[PDB]
């Protein structure tokens, strides 16, 4: 749950000389004393209970373990990692609303992928290198990077479709009846139809609009993989 995580750090006190048959450890108070504590500024203290443990199987083991339950104050990281990550992620969908004539789809999608990968590496450098669980932020960034790679492939295909002319490609009848008649109706596009080259351009634009919807429902549903964190 980084950076909204809560840590449970313990301090175990024992006598490394005498066993339970020589000295018995007792707790003066059930919790650690904060009578002279200086607030951290990054970490919030929740509970400092103290428990005396014995081992029923050994009878020579005794210790006192203080569980330090601390809660991170998340404003710093919420400002320095999450907001930039969300801003970068919001650009994943624009490539599908970018006209293919501009010749900048590759730049936009590749830059988005670069930024997401850099943020993922930074997050990997901030958290311990343990393989027990994955930060929800890291998982969400990974899923976004996969989506952006898929978008790069789709943009390559759409650019290939867009730059087609009747002198180099022939449009099959099924392509016509699908992309120029049926699919546009579902997406509320209603080709003006007021010459073959411009049909190819429209077909390429139809594919973009279709994927703009898919990358919006999924991205919006991507809140399910992010809203759970806070």
């Amino acid at each position, epitope marked *: 749950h980084f950076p909204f995580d809560q840590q449970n750090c313990t301090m175990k006190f024992r006598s490394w000389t005498y066993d339970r048959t020589e000295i018995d450890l007792v707790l003066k108070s059930e919790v650690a*004393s904060l*009578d002279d504590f200086t607030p951290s500024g990054e970490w*919030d203290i929740v509970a400092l209970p103290g428990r005396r443990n014995e081992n029923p199987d050994d009878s020579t083991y005794v210790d006192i373990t203080y569980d330090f339950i601390i809660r991170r104050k998340p404003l710093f990281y919420t400002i320095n990692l999450i907001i930039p990550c969300v801003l970068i992620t919001s650009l994943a969908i624009l490539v599908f609303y970018l006209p293919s004539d501009c010749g900048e789809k590759m730049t936009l999608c590749i830059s988005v992928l670069l930024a997401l990968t850099v943020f993922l590496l930074l997050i990997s450098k901030i958290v311990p290198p343990t393989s027990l669980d994955v930060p929800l932020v890291g998982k969400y960034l990974m899923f976004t990077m996969v989506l952006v790679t898929f978008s790069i492939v789709t943009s390559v295909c759409v650019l290939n479709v867009h730059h087609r002319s009747p002198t180099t490609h022939t449009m099959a009848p099924w392509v016509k009846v699908v992309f120029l008649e049926k699919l546009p109706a579902l997406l509320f596009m209603q080709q003006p139809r007021h010459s073959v080259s411009e049909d190819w351009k429209y077909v390429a634009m139809v594919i973009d609009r279709l994927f703009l919807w898919i990358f919006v429902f999924v991205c919006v549903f991507g809140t399910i993989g992010m809203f759970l964190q806070p």
Partner: antibody
Amino acid sequence: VQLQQSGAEVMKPGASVKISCKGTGYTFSSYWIEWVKQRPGHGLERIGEILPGSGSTNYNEKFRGKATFTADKSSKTAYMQLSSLTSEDSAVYYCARYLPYYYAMDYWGQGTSVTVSS
Amino acid sequence: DVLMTQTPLSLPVSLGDQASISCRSSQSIVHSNGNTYLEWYLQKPGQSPKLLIYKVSNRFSGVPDRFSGSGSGTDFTLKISRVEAEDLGVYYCFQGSHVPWTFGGGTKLEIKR
């Protein structure tokens, strides 16, 4: 263990009160002090909490801004201040000893009765 | 916040008759530590509430054995085997898991005759 609260307070509308909860017989600075409001009608509502050792405080959305917690360590007392008193703020307020994820609200104050009226 | 609801608002039951109070949660209050922090507080009229049950089942030291809590997930019940006069009062739930910590609606137990 024992938590002692201040006596009943009567204040005019628009004033501000300061209720004091004093705890003895345990490590005061290491236990949260839950403040609970109980309207005469019905319902226990948690106002917020404070950890006297540090300065951390949480306020429920309903009471945010209405209540302010200040904790004095020298004298084992924690104070709640209510701002802009009104009619519906008249109720009995309790202070309790809580440690999250551990020992529950086992000990409570005797209850301070606050009434707002001109 | 986690909205806590209790039913019934009133549960009339004659002396010596078993009673059951229901406690539902807006969302699961189970915690990563392996325990769920639900508590039951009884408030006799004109007195501060007294803790009865914490962590669903565990009984606060010094309470009559007749009290017994149970449940899991978002359904918890507090059972009283043989009620008496001293069992009159209002029972409140309390979730100690998800900050901020909120109280239940409150269940006014009465006796039927």
